[PDB]
Amino acid sequence: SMNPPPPETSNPNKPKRQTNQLQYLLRVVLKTLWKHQFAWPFQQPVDAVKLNLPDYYKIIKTPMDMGTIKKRLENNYYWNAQECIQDFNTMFTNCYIYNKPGDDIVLMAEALEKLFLQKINELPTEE
Ligand SMILES: CCc1c(C(=O)n2ccc3ccc(S(=O)(=O)NC)cc32)[nH]c(C)c1C(C)=O
Numbered sequence: 001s002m003n004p005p006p007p008e009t010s011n012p013n014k015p016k017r018q019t020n021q022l023q024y025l026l027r028v029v030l031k032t033l034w035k036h037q038f039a040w041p042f043q044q045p046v047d048a049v050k051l052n053l054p055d056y057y058k059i060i061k062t063p064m065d066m067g068t069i070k071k072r073l074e075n076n077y078y079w080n081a082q083e084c085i086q087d088f089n090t091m092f093t094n095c096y097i098y099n100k101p102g103d104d105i106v107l108m109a110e111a112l113e114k115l116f117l118q119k120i121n122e123l124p125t126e127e
């Protein structure tokens with residue numbers, strides 16, 4: 001069994017910019033989630049080899065994780081907040097699709113998503 005290459009965090013051909021909203025997403029949203037007690041399972045891509053989950057990348061075809069997101073933010077990879085938010089949302093949805101309701105990983109994702117949504121609710125208006 002084999003892990004795919006992680007999602008790209010650099011691409012010179014991709015259009016990108018810095019925006020106060022993206023700055024907020026790194027400085028407030030990502031930092032708050034990263035430090036959370038339940039962050040660790042989401043801080044790097046799922047290692048399906050180590051975890052013996054040969055089915056994972058056969059069903060999750062758009063994997064995403066906060067390590068990848070943190071890197072994209074730090075490299076100013078995104079064009080807008082909406083792209084970054086989509087990545088977070090893909091991360092959560094993937095978790096809910098693959099795992100059973102009530103699994104620890106799901107409970108952990110739900111807690112993080114609740115905090116995520118609280119912070120997104122106060123996304124500053126774009127300057
Ligand atoms: C349930 C597996 C999983 C994790 C996960 O990372 N883990 C959950 C238990 C667990 C134990 C050790 C290690 S580890 O040894 O690889 N250390 C980081 C990782 C672990 N994250 C996500 C998003 C998922 C799924 C399938 O949704």
Ligand code: NI
Pocket residue numbers: 080
């Ligand atoms: Ni726009």
